[PDB]
Structure formats: structure tokens, C-alpha cells
mmCIF file with all atom_site columns, C-alpha atoms in Angstrom:
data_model
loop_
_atom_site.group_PDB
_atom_site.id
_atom_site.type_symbol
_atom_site.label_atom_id
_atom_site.label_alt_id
_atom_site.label_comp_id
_atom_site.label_asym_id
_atom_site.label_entity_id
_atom_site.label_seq_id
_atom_site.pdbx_PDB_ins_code
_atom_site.Cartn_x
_atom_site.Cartn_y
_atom_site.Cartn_z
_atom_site.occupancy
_atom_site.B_iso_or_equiv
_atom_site.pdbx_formal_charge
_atom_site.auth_seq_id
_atom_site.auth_comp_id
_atom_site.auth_asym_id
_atom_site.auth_atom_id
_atom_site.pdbx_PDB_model_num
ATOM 1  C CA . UNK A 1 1  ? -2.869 9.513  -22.222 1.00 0.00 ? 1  UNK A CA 1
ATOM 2  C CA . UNK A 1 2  ? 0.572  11.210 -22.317 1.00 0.00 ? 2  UNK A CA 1
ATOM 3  C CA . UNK A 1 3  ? 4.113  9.129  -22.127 1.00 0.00 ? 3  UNK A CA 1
ATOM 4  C CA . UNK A 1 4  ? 7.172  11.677 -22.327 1.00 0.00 ? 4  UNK A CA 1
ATOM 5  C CA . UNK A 1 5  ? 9.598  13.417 -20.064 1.00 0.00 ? 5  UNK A CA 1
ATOM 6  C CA . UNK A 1 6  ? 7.671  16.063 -21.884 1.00 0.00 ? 6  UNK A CA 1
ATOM 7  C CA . UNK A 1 7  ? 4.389  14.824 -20.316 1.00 0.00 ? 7  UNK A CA 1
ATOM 8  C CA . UNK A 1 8  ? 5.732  15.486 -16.766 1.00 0.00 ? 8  UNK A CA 1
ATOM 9  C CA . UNK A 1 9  ? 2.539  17.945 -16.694 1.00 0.00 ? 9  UNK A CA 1
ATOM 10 C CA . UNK A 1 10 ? -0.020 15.650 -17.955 1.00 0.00 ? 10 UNK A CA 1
ATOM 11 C CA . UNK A 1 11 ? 1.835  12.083 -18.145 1.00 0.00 ? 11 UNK A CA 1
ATOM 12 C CA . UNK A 1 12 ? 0.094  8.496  -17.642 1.00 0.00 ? 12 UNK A CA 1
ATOM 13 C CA . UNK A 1 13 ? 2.011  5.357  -18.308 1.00 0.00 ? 13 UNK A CA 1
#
């Protein structure tokens, strides 16, 4: 999984 403001495309957490 993803976990950024950078994963706002592809974030889950």
C-alpha cells in the first residue's frame, strides 16, 4: 500500500 499526501492517487492507510 501507499501512505502520503503524495499517494492521493493510489493511497491506503
Amino acid at each position: 500500500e501507499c501512505c502520503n499526501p503524495a499517494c492521493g492517487r493510489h493511497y491506503s492507510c
